[PDB]
Design an enzyme around this catalytic site. Structure first.
Site, mmCIF file in Angstrom:
data_model
loop_
_atom_site.group_PDB
_atom_site.id
_atom_site.type_symbol
_atom_site.label_atom_id
_atom_site.label_comp_id
_atom_site.label_asym_id
_atom_site.label_seq_id
_atom_site.Cartn_x
_atom_site.Cartn_y
_atom_site.Cartn_z
ATOM 1 N N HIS A 8 -11.765 -2.923 -9.352
ATOM 2 C CA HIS A 8 -10.942 -2.112 -8.452
ATOM 3 C C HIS A 8 -11.442 -0.672 -8.454
ATOM 4 O O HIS A 8 -11.053 0.109 -9.320
ATOM 5 C CB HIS A 8 -9.476 -2.176 -8.852
ATOM 6 C CG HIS A 8 -8.564 -1.494 -7.882
ATOM 7 N ND1 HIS A 8 -7.646 -2.181 -7.122
ATOM 8 C CD2 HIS A 8 -8.432 -0.190 -7.544
ATOM 9 C CE1 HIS A 8 -6.976 -1.331 -6.366
ATOM 10 N NE2 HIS A 8 -7.437 -0.117 -6.600
ATOM 11 N N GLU A 20 2.696 -0.806 -4.814
ATOM 12 C CA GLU A 20 2.440 0.372 -5.639
ATOM 13 C C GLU A 20 3.633 1.315 -5.496
ATOM 14 O O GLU A 20 3.563 2.379 -4.879
ATOM 15 C CB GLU A 20 1.133 1.038 -5.228
ATOM 16 C CG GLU A 20 0.582 2.061 -6.230
ATOM 17 C CD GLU A 20 -0.657 2.809 -5.713
ATOM 18 O OE1 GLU A 20 -1.110 2.512 -4.582
ATOM 19 O OE2 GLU A 20 -1.196 3.674 -6.451
ATOM 20 N N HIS A 36 -12.833 2.783 -5.708
ATOM 21 C CA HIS A 36 -12.986 3.391 -4.392
ATOM 22 C C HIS A 36 -14.251 4.234 -4.418
ATOM 23 O O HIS A 36 -14.386 5.124 -5.264
ATOM 24 C CB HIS A 36 -11.766 4.236 -4.026
ATOM 25 C CG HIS A 36 -10.500 3.444 -3.912
ATOM 26 N ND1 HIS A 36 -9.984 3.030 -2.702
ATOM 27 C CD2 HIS A 36 -9.653 2.978 -4.861
ATOM 28 C CE1 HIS A 36 -8.869 2.349 -2.909
ATOM 29 N NE2 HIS A 36 -8.648 2.300 -4.211
ATOM 30 N N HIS A 82 -2.696 -2.994 -8.136
ATOM 31 C CA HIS A 82 -1.511 -2.361 -8.712
ATOM 32 C C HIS A 82 -0.382 -3.357 -8.971
ATOM 33 O O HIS A 82 -0.118 -3.704 -10.126
ATOM 34 C CB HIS A 82 -1.029 -1.214 -7.821
ATOM 35 C CG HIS A 82 -2.075 -0.176 -7.567
ATOM 36 N ND1 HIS A 82 -2.461 0.734 -8.528
ATOM 37 C CD2 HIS A 82 -2.823 0.094 -6.468
ATOM 38 C CE1 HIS A 82 -3.397 1.523 -8.030
ATOM 39 N NE2 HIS A 82 -3.637 1.155 -6.784
ATOM 40 N N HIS A 96 -3.974 -3.931 -1.561
ATOM 41 C CA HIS A 96 -3.077 -3.111 -2.368
ATOM 42 C C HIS A 96 -1.646 -3.517 -2.047
ATOM 43 O O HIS A 96 -1.281 -3.640 -0.877
ATOM 44 C CB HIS A 96 -3.264 -1.616 -2.064
ATOM 45 C CG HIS A 96 -4.477 -0.986 -2.688
ATOM 46 N ND1 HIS A 96 -5.753 -1.460 -2.488
ATOM 47 C CD2 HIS A 96 -4.605 0.096 -3.498
ATOM 48 C CE1 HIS A 96 -6.617 -0.707 -3.150
ATOM 49 N NE2 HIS A 96 -5.947 0.244 -3.778
#
Ligand SMILES: *[C@@H]1O[C@H](CO)[C@@H](O[C@@H]2O[C@H](CO)[C@@H](O[C@@H]3O[C@H](CO[C@H]4O[C@H](CO)[C@@H](O)[C@H](O)[C@@H]4O)[C@@H](O)[C@H](O)[C@@H]3O)[C@H](O)[C@H]2NC(C)=O)[C@H](O)[C@H]1NC(C)=O
Ligand SMILES: *[C@@H]1O[C@H](CO)[C@@H](O[C@@H]2O[C@H](CO)[C@@H](O[C@@H]3O[C@H](CO[C@H]4O[C@H](CO)[C@@H](O)[C@H](O)[C@@H]4O)[C@@H](O)[C@H](O)[C@@H]3O)[C@H](O)[C@H]2NC(C)=O)[C@H](O)[C@H]1NC(C)=O
Ligand SMILES: O=P(O)(O)OC[C@H]1O[C@@H](n2cnc3c2N=CNC[C@H]3O)C[C@@H]1O
Ligand SMILES: O=P(O)(O)OC[C@H]1O[C@@H](n2cnc3c2N=CNC[C@H]3O)C[C@@H]1O
Ligand SMILES: *[C@@H]1O[C@H](CO)[C@@H](O)[C@H](O)[C@H]1NC(C)=O
Ligand SMILES: *[C@@H]1O[C@H](CO)[C@@H](O)[C@H](O)[C@H]1NC(C)=O
Ligand SMILES: *[C@@H]1O[C@H](CO)[C@@H](O)[C@H](O)[C@H]1NC(C)=O
Ligand SMILES: *[C@@H]1O[C@H](CO)[C@@H](O)[C@H](O)[C@H]1NC(C)=O
Ligand SMILES: *[C@@H]1O[C@H](CO)[C@@H](O)[C@H](O)[C@H]1NC(C)=O
Ligand SMILES: *[C@@H]1O[C@H](CO)[C@@H](O)[C@H](O)[C@H]1NC(C)=O
Ligand SMILES: [Zn+2]
Ligand SMILES: [Zn+2]
Lengths: 494, 494
Positions: free
Chosen positions: B90, B338, B92, B363, B335
């Site tokens: 995970h 969260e 970015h 998350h 995602h």
């Protein structure tokens, strides 16, 4: 049917399956109850949507010091005030009534002395034979200081401020577990000397009963050390004396207010005393349960759990009743796992609590971290007493939506809601904790079935006999119908 | 035997049944592995027992700004650095490498301009055809201002300081969800202009592979928007260009480092775009998955989840692949949840995430609050990507020991550990999140079986094919054996 429509049907089924497992999902509401449920849900949704979409703070989840006034300015809180919440099952007698009464009533009696201790906190005591025998503090007569203040209201307000935990924000002023527990223990030592004087203690217990009744609570089970009540002449009474004092005050209150259900007493001992003392207290609890089987419930160990002794440390004491010939079953009401720790002495208290056949578990904050323990406790019908405001103030969690017991509520675990020491931090007897539970411990679609289930649970998981539970439910039902009728007629058009 | 001895046997049986259900409980350790396990457990127990019994703060659970130096002074952190942790699943791309490289390498190239925006944040951009065409900011050339500083190190350090989230304590400086998300978005907008320039972007991706390899991570799956890479002349490339740029850098890295496993890419779009644009991105992802079936994995939606659109809002886009003739399976990596909210749009994203056949969930902080969702996802083998440091910094929980997924770990839920945006808040690629997982997300009796199971899970729950997983486990097994043998020889007597 569209592929999108088949997807939407599957989503509806899945969401219904998930939501049908929460606490109170089997509660059926009448049309008037649904009026009340919509009223509550509307304000709850307004708050949630404003916080989420306008990206602003969600006040019901903030520190109690900051949210208490906001809570007091909401319509739903007045609804919760009027609601008969059933029974408060988790209380400590020395912090279950207003500091306001201690200041405005108790410190106006004769022989009450005050002093400023080494930590700059006010201490109150009663001494009938002249000034207190501890000269390490400079004791003054409370009446003399009040007279010399020149402003009685200012003096009384300062006294209440110097005793309360909500004078400042605890999360800011005492920002650690150690610091807030220091403040909490200091509070108890501030009031120890005056609240154990027998007349004051009796009147204080009466005040507990009155305040809980006026907050529409009909039943309380109170934890008390029960001994050490003293007279002006120095006589100190035993546990049976305290038990009977409470019992007669309770019976008088019951005759005076037939709507009230009653009160029962659990003996409490301290988690840092010697094993000899705890064994003595267990024998005392055995005698008290033998002789007052309908008023005395059992035994518990209290005080801060992290740095003090485990239940296993006192095993010989706690096993003493069961090794008798014939065995004696002394009911237990252990505080257990009031902790953030995992696989340590503190949360493994849960193992002991279940193996000692505890009737309920106080707090149980780490229970969710133990799958087998959670299953065993659910199988045995062991309810968990939840005190949300307490857990926030005493450093277990900051955001109440992060409370460790929220998942257990969402999976129909047997739980009750109570206030641990409402008087120490200026909460209403039960209304504030119910409001916090409603706003934080359940979701955006849950209002009234959840609260009604809590009220029912406080009777079902009480230590009452079955006959007592049937009668208690009848009294509570009468009050609940009265409350529904009155609230609906004040809210719905004629 | 004795009533006490029978009690102790039943207590031992109950406690080990509870503990045998945690993540990694089925791991068998060799004698050398046990040497390392005892080494780690000793320091962990020292810290936990010191904090609990001496009533002091537990640094591993504090804010990352305050605990990072403490972590860097522990022996266990060096062990965890040396441990081959497998794959980071995970990440970015624009926040997966050090800001230090952006400062010391990227802002030393020509045509890099800086400015101070209205909120006093530095913005960096590349413009090859004169100063930037936005007159709302007053742009200066970075080379000239750096020259006029007189202390290049001081200038570069200030530049890094104006970009990092860990220059101040985020829990203090941005003490709300909106405030910290404002800072996070500002960070990405500070670097937008310089990090999408094609040469800088390619070198930055190379830096990602170098840093994760040096932190003993052999496999990465990265989320990326993939499009918008621009040249000095104004040319802007499409998503396939970015995909191939990444692919060639990855293949070059693999040839240069046979110990490395590789890297794969997930296309990411923003949660606040129109349904039309998200549908376009779904079509692009479909084409990329058809044409690069082994490097491109699927699609994801990113950006802050609370105030932006739900998955249901994009249902028509997300359902588009399945309504094809024949239906197309576009893998999703959503995602989801969260959030601290319950029974709202945000956490009900999980329902949609599961009904869309997501491979993993990012998350998943609210998953524990939905018992049916947890059961369904566990049955479907949907792993949850856990990013503890990210969840603390971006306002989901303060005490890491209160993290919502600790109970799921305690019941052997399929999870992996990653760093969300390690570059934005100055964490190591994966070692810091592993250290926090070790110290906070599991109990006092768990060290090495847990970490080894996390490493194994990152291969089992990768998006690799089965053949690729077999090869990856062999490569990782080689590295793990090397690490164990080397560490034991450095710690044990000859
Ligand atoms: C917590 O609750 C537990 C469950 O109630 C308590 O354990 C029980 O304790 C009672 C009283 O000591 C025991 O009752 C005695 O049982 C035996 C016969 O039981 C078995 O005997 C053999 C061996 O298996 C077998 O053939 C029989 O069919 C029975 O299964 C006799 O000695 C006595 O007459 C008497 O009835 C229970 O056996 C015992 N139950 C369990 C499930 O262990 C426990 O004491 C409580 N603990 C505390 C701390 O309060
Ligand atoms: C997520 O994954 C799900 C499971 O893989 C996907 O659901 C599957 O969708 C496909 C494509 O539409 C279906 O395959 C077709 O099925 C039918 C026959 O299905 C049933 O027909 C009757 C109805 O009960 C029954 O008697 C039969 O025994 C079958 O069970 C035919 O039209 C085609 O031959 C074709 O194979 C799957 O049936 C369906 N699986 C399930 C378990 O529902 C879902 O589409 C995926 N979603 C996304 C968003 O990717
Ligand atoms: O003077 P007393 O003995 O009657 O009570 C005073 C004592 O009560 C204890 N206590 C009161 N509320 C609680 C307590 N402990 C543990 N968990 C939290 C809460 O539930 C501590 C105090 O020293
Ligand atoms: O597309 P870019 O790479 O240029 O910007 C990166 C974009 O990713 C999003 N993001 C980055 N880390 C996260 C994101 N979203 C949500 N959850 C938390 C975390 O996992 C937002 C940012 O604007
Ligand atoms: C957000 O605030 C505005 C006032 O500016 C109000 O009109 C709006 O209803 C609020 N949104 C929600 C969801 O309450
Ligand atoms: C305190 O309350 C008691 C009744 O419980 C009452 O008799 C007494 O007058 C009160 N004392 C003061 C000082 O107000
Ligand atoms: C109590 O009173 C003293 C003296 O007025 C004051 O300085 C102190 O801050 C007070 N303490 C608390 C805890 O309110
Ligand atoms: C508490 O601190 C002392 C040093 O003052 C240390 O010797 C002791 O071991 C600590 N306690 C624990 C449980 O580590
Ligand atoms: C950026 O730098 C300016 C001064 O150069 C300073 O005032 C500002 O606070 C800095 N901002 C951050 C986020 O570090
Ligand atoms: C930046 O790093 C790249 C490789 O990642 C290298 O080719 C280049 O020379 C470096 N640039 C500077 C200005 O140091
Ligand atoms: Zn309590
Ligand atoms: Zn992410």
């Amino acid at each position: 049917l569209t592929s999108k429509a088949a997807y939407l049907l599957k989503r509806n089924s899945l969401i219904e399956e998930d939501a049908s497992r929460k606490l109170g999902a089997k509660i059926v509401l009448t049309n008037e109850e649904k009026v009340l449920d919509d009223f509550i849900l509307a304000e709850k949704r307004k708050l949630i949507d404003d916080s989420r979409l306008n990206q602003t703070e969600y006040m019901p989840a903030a520190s109690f010091y900051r949210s208490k006034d906001f809570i007091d300015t909401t319509f739903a809180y007045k609804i919760i005030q009027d609601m008969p919440k059933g029974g408060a099952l988790h209380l400590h007698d020395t912090a279950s009534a207003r500091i306001d009464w201690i200041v405005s009533n108790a410190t106006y009696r004769d022989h009450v002395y005050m002093c400023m201790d080494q930590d700059n906190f006010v201490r109150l005591t009663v001494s009938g034979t002249g000034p207190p025998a501890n000269s390490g503090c400079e004791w003054k007569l409370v009446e003399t200081e009040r007279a010399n203040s020149g402003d009685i209201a200012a003096f009384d307000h300062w006294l209440k401020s110097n005793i309360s935990l909500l004078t400042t924000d605890p999360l800011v002023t005492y920002p650690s577990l150690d610091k807030v527990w220091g403040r909490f223990d200091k509070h108890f030592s501030q009031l120890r000397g005056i609240i154990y004087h027998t007349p004051i203690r009796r009147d204080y217990y009466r005040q507990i009963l009155e305040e809980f009744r006026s907050d529409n609570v009909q039943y309380v089970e109170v934890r008390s050390s029960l001994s050490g009540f003293f007279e002006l002449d120095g006589t100190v009474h035993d546990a049976e004396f305290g038990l009977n004092l409470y019992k007669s005050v309770t019976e008088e209150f019951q005759r005076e207010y037939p709507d009230f259900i009653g009160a029962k007493i659990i003996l409490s001992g301290l988690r840092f005393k010697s094993q000899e003392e705890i064994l003595n207290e267990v024998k005392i609890a055995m005698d008290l349960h033998k002789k007052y089987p309908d008023f005395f419930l059992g035994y518990d160990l209290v005080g801060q759990e992290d740095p003090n002794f485990s239940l296993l440390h006192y095993l010989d004491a706690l096993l003493y009743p069961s090794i008798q010939n014939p065995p004696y079953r002394l009911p237990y009401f252990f505080h257990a796992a009031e902790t953030n720790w995992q696989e340590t002495e503190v949360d493994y208290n849960l193992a002991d609590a279940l193996l000692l056949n505890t009737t309920r578990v106080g707090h149980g904050f780490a229970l969710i971290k133990h799958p087998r323990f959670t299953e065993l406790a659910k199988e045995n019908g062991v309810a968990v007493e939840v005190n949300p405001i307490s857990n926030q103030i005493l450093g277990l969690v900051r955001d109440v939506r992060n409370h460790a017991l929220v998942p257990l509520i969402a999976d129909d675990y047997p739980i009750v809601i109570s206030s641990d020491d409402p008087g120490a931090w200026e909460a209403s007897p039960l209304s504030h904790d119910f409001y916090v539970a409603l706003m934080d411990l359940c979701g955006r679609d849950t209002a009234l079935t959840f609260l009604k289930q809590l009220a029912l649970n406080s009777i079902r998981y009480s230590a009452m006999s079955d006959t007592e539970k049937v009668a208690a439910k009848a009294k509570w039902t009468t009050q609940w119908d009265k409350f529904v009728k009155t609230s609906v007629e004040g809210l719905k058009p004629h």
